[PDB]
Write a protein that binds this ligand. Structure first.
Ligand SMILES: NC(=O)c1cnc(N[C@@H]2CCCC[C@@H]2N)nc1Nc1cccc(-n2nccn2)c1
Length: 268
């Protein structure tokens, strides 16, 4: 996992803990374009824990880590997803079709089905953390809050924090318990963001007002032009009771089947 600084070439400009910069890494033969997270002891430990999670994952729909390097600061080197975050892409590309959005959120569900099978919880699943390789190829990124589940438990219990509350399930807020089912709830919010072309969820509401709304059984409305089948899936992800909420195997299957029905309608 330890990379050679002499083989890494960093660009001066910043793409976006610190910063994300574009670079190039000399591989065995080819040169590879990379995205590098550069830190600007708690930050070092967090980056190394993130590196430890990514090291264990191998799936076409999850950003691959190339390695780590300790130079000017600690650096986490990843494969580059040229088109950037999904929310920003859709805000700038409103012509993207409903079929293309289904294709991308289905890819995220495949990556998450893999993470669930791997017994890792993401804990920051949102459209800003889905990166586009192409307009037809999404990858999940940003494993800074992710956790490997213990062998005897299907959830992570947080003790302390600065949380993305609008993407969190009720049991995360009420019991500090994070599971693959909690990530399913976040995935419902991510689907809403995607079909709303990168609009922020729960516009104009405080985190506490969001909790109050959800407790009353109320949910965000259907985005303009969103297929009813996809809005129904969002509502199923937003099942209040964790036991009754589907896991990613059930979600990916529903998305897969619907995507094939849409691919069929297009051919007709
Ligand atoms: N492998 C990667 O390509 C990569 C992995 N992870 C991330 N993480 C960032 C953290 C900052 C928030 C946004 C995102 N979750 N960004 C990556 N690339 C990237 C590519 C183009 C643009 C940007 N970009 N545009 C605006 C901000 N960042 C990032």
């Amino acid at each position: 996992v330890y990379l050679d600084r002499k083989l890494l070439t960093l660009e001066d400009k910043e793409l976006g803990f610190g910063t994300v910069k574009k670079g190039y890494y000399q591989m065995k033969k080819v040169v590879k374009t990379v995205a590098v997270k550069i830190l600007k002891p708690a930050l070092k430990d967090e980056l190394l824990a993130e590196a430890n999670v990514m090291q264990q994952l191998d799936n076409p729909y999850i950003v691959r880590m190339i390695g780590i390097c300790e130079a000017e600061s600690w650096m986490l080197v990843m494969e580059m997803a040229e088109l950037g975050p999904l929310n920003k892409y859709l805000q700038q590309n409103r012509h993207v079709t409903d079929k293309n959005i289904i294709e991308l959120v289905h890819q995220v569900s495949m990556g998450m089905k893999y993470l669930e099978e791997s017994n890792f919880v993401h804990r920051d699943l949102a459209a800003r953390n889905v990166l586009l390789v192409t307009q037809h190829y999404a990858k999940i990124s940003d494993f800074g809050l992710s956790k490997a589940l213990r062998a005897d438990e299907n959830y992570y219990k947080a003790q302390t924090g600065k949380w993305p509350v609008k993407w969190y399930a009720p049991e995360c807020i009420n019991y500090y318990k994070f599971s693959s089912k909690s990530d399913v709830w976040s995935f419902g919010v991510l689907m809403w963001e995607a079909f709303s072309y990168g609009q922020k969820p729960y516009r104009g509401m405080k985190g506490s007002e969001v909790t109050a709304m959800l407790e009353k059984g109320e949910r965000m409305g259907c985005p303009a032009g969103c297929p009813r089948e996809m809005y129904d899936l969002m509502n199923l992800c937003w099942t209040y009771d964790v036991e009754n909420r589907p896991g990613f195997a059930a979600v990916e299957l529903r998305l897969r089947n619907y995507y094939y029905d849409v691919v069929n309608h297009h051919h007709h």
